[PDB]
Amino acid sequence: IQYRCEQLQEIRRASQREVMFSAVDPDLSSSTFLEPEVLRDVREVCKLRFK
Amino acid sequence: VKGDYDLQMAHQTSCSSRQDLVCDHLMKQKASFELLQLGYELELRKHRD
C-alpha cells in the first residue's frame, strides 16, 4: 500500500504547475529555444499517428 | 474546348490542393483525439489493479 501511495505522490508532484509553453512566434525562426519534452513527445506521437 | 479544359484542369488542381489541406487538418485532429482516447483506456486498467 505504501509503495502505491509513493508512486501516486510522485505523479502529483510532477503535475504541480509544470511545463512553460513558449508561444512560438512563428516568425522568430532563430531562437533555439528548447521545446519542452512533453510537447515534443506529444507532437511526435501525434505526427506519427497523422502520417 | 482546349481553352476550357485548361481552365477546368487548373480549377481542379486548385480544388484538390484545397481539399488536401482540409483532409490534413481533420486527420491531425483525429490523431489528437485518438491519443486522448487511448489515454482514458490506459487509465481504467490501473484503477482495476
PDB file of C-alpha atoms in Angstrom, chain A:
ATOM      1  CA  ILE A   1       0.000   0.000   0.000  1.00  0.00           C
ATOM      2  CA  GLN A   2       2.865   2.410   0.928  1.00  0.00           C
ATOM      3  CA  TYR A   3       4.568   1.569  -2.319  1.00  0.00           C
ATOM      4  CA  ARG A   4       1.476   2.573  -4.259  1.00  0.00           C
ATOM      5  CA  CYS A   5       0.952   5.862  -2.402  1.00  0.00           C
ATOM      6  CA  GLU A   6       4.564   6.779  -3.060  1.00  0.00           C
ATOM      7  CA  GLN A   7       4.065   6.209  -6.743  1.00  0.00           C
ATOM      8  CA  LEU A   8       0.886   8.452  -6.888  1.00  0.00           C
ATOM      9  CA  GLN A   9       2.566  11.158  -4.790  1.00  0.00           C
ATOM     10  CA  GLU A  10       5.384  11.238  -7.308  1.00  0.00           C
ATOM     11  CA  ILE A  11       2.830  11.778 -10.098  1.00  0.00           C
ATOM     12  CA  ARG A  12       1.152  14.624  -8.117  1.00  0.00           C
ATOM     13  CA  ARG A  13       4.462  16.332  -7.596  1.00  0.00           C
ATOM     14  CA  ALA A  14       5.258  16.064 -11.290  1.00  0.00           C
ATOM     15  CA  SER A  15       1.825  17.539 -12.137  1.00  0.00           C
ATOM     16  CA  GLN A  16       2.363  20.678  -9.980  1.00  0.00           C
ATOM     17  CA  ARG A  17       2.274  23.824 -12.207  1.00  0.00           C
ATOM     18  CA  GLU A  18       4.898  22.481 -14.653  1.00  0.00           C
ATOM     19  CA  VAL A  19       5.594  22.939 -18.448  1.00  0.00           C
ATOM     20  CA  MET A  20       6.310  26.520 -19.746  1.00  0.00           C
ATOM     21  CA  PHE A  21       4.842  26.534 -23.258  1.00  0.00           C
ATOM     22  CA  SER A  22       6.509  29.451 -25.080  1.00  0.00           C
ATOM     23  CA  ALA A  23       4.288  30.866 -27.765  1.00  0.00           C
ATOM     24  CA  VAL A  24       6.471  30.058 -30.683  1.00  0.00           C
ATOM     25  CA  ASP A  25       6.108  33.329 -32.600  1.00  0.00           C
ATOM     26  CA  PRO A  26       6.237  31.565 -35.881  1.00  0.00           C
ATOM     27  CA  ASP A  27       8.427  34.409 -37.467  1.00  0.00           C
ATOM     28  CA  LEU A  28      11.043  34.120 -34.919  1.00  0.00           C
ATOM     29  CA  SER A  29      12.882  31.318 -36.504  1.00  0.00           C
ATOM     30  CA  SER A  30      16.222  31.666 -34.760  1.00  0.00           C
ATOM     31  CA  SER A  31      15.915  31.479 -31.022  1.00  0.00           C
ATOM     32  CA  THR A  32      16.963  27.896 -30.336  1.00  0.00           C
ATOM     33  CA  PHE A  33      14.528  27.850 -27.591  1.00  0.00           C
ATOM     34  CA  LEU A  34      14.410  24.199 -26.424  1.00  0.00           C
ATOM     35  CA  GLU A  35      10.687  22.727 -26.685  1.00  0.00           C
ATOM     36  CA  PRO A  36       9.581  21.186 -23.507  1.00  0.00           C
ATOM     37  CA  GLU A  37       9.998  17.415 -23.586  1.00  0.00           C
ATOM     38  CA  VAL A  38       6.274  16.872 -23.079  1.00  0.00           C
ATOM     39  CA  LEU A  39       5.418  18.996 -26.060  1.00  0.00           C
ATOM     40  CA  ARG A  40       7.994  17.280 -28.313  1.00  0.00           C
ATOM     41  CA  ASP A  41       6.797  13.775 -27.227  1.00  0.00           C
ATOM     42  CA  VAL A  42       3.138  14.606 -27.687  1.00  0.00           C
ATOM     43  CA  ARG A  43       3.702  16.241 -31.038  1.00  0.00           C
ATOM     44  CA  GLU A  44       5.822  13.361 -32.259  1.00  0.00           C
ATOM     45  CA  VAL A  45       3.149  10.902 -31.083  1.00  0.00           C
ATOM     46  CA  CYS A  46       0.505  12.880 -32.871  1.00  0.00           C
ATOM     47  CA  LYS A  47       2.625  13.327 -36.075  1.00  0.00           C
ATOM     48  CA  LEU A  48       3.393   9.651 -36.147  1.00  0.00           C
ATOM     49  CA  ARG A  49      -0.253   8.852 -35.957  1.00  0.00           C
ATOM     50  CA  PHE A  50      -1.086  11.546 -38.636  1.00  0.00           C
ATOM     51  CA  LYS A  51       1.469  10.117 -41.086  1.00  0.00           C
TER      52      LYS A  51
END
